Amino acid sequence: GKGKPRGLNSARKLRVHRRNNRWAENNYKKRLLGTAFKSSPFGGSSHAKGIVLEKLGIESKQPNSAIRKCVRVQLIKNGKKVTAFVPNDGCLNFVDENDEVLLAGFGRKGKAKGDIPGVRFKVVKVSGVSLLALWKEKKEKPRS
Amino acid sequence: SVGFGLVYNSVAEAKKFEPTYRLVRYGLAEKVEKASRQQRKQKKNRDKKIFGTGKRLAKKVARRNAD
Amino acid sequence: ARGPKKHLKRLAAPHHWLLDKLSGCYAPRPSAGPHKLRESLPLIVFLRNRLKYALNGREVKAILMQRHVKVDGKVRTDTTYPAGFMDVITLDATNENFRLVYDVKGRFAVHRITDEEASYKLGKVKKVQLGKKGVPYVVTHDGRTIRYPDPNIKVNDTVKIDLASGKITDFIKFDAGKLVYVTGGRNLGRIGTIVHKERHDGGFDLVHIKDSLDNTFVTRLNNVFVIGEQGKPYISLPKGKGIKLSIAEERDRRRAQQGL
């Protein structure tokens, strides 16, 4: 019964057949195709710093309704064009075109967060300085 | 306060066997006024560019600039 | 690695020296000599780690440079000279005669023998060869070669050497019963008779052993060092006679000897 070999000598089959099924698992397969190195905008890196190209007013999905304040960024190490979300009340005024900004993920491990569509990254620093310091008026955006 | 101590059998027999850094604490030895390592080294390399006495070399150099 | 190595990282050294972990990156590293560097004992480790007669490694040399120390009678001056098993070491300027001989753990115990006895040692023969010009010779475990030996002397048999003339003065054969010292392995430091030698063609003869307590342990022929007759040592054994006790029996002997 049970539909799998039980023999004392069936170790190869058991070993290989699990090797064969480990592919139906995302994280595994994601780890062996080296997708983070290849497809992902960061190189699998946790952060990446790019240059701001334009501001976006992205409308959120249903059943929400607002304008979701983001920027298009060209990652330095790639040249990759990625769009990231500037968080908190009016922080989009802290960032400007050709600024350079630190981007990070959204803790969704690839996926987009909340209701903002196609935006899988968030702005953490602009022009060397953190936002939750600019926002809190602890420091000021260096006059460039 | 716990420390360590030594009692040699005669002064100069301590003179001998004592690390010279201790003796200078005791006014038992004089401080060698020496060139810093880098300065010592930079000389070892400067002299190294010379083969022989140098006193020949100085004649070599000086004859040139007196015509 | 392009040639012979000259350093010893302090961690790759033999544990049975008991050097500390910290306090430096390197260990002494035995020079080339009588004993295999892993099976040896530098004079620096004896004279400051095992006797505390020195502190600095500098003061080790200053003692040696004073010729203050003989090994096997010859005055040795190399800081990291590789002394070993059955060696003597004689600090004359203080009337001390030792003999590097094993602990009951696997270490080199500070064994003090008399001002006599230091006039000889023992030697396990390693090979017995016909040299050139027909001369025969034996080779002992400390790189001693003695030409013209007793024809009876075969390999593994020990040999009573003097210490200012070479020369064998009686010896012991390897048969059942003899009193044996284990010189390495899991039983290093132990002493016992024989019972059996289990020979194996191809390689590796094991030698079953029994001590003075009816505990039977086994090692490899390589590690066995005959030193005389049953209950009759040809030298002075260290304290405990290399009998070995359990951690249990250890602990009892401690707390009992402890107090009063």
């Binding site: - | - | 990282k9 302090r10 961690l11 972990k21 910290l22 430096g24 990156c25 951690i247 249990a248 602990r251």
Partner: protein
Amino acid sequence: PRAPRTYSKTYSTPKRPYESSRLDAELKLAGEFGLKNKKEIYRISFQLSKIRRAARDLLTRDEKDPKRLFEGNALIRRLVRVGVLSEDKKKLDYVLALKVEDFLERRLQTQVYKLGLAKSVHHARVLITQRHIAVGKQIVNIPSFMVRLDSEKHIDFAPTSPFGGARPGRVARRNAARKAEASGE
């Protein structure tokens, strides 16, 4: 190329961050033994676990096991020498029922209090960490000391510090000195 001067950590945060039940009990403890934070309980909660594990494993073995007896009685003899295990509860079965406050009680902190000297653990806190203590000749300014049996009859004030003789403190000495240069001359 040196030797990796080894180390390890002492505590162990709880698997579930917000248990109103657990969080209550932890706070009760922090107040009666007069602790500083939750880490000082995590430290002891963790210590306790290995002990119970060490004993959890030894008990599975056949009795009169050469290793069980040595490593057990050695465990028991230590636990008793500090005042956490009862003098005649010397069995591994009784160490698995051991709980946090047993350990927590034996701190210098709750000894300076538990025999005069303090009349408050929070008083006892500041007394220890201000040199006003001496397990014999030795000052001990760590609240988490751990007082051993035959050491219990030695916990007293310092040969230094006003509460032990030789000079009063430097605030007293500034008061009896300001009534001097003034009301005197």
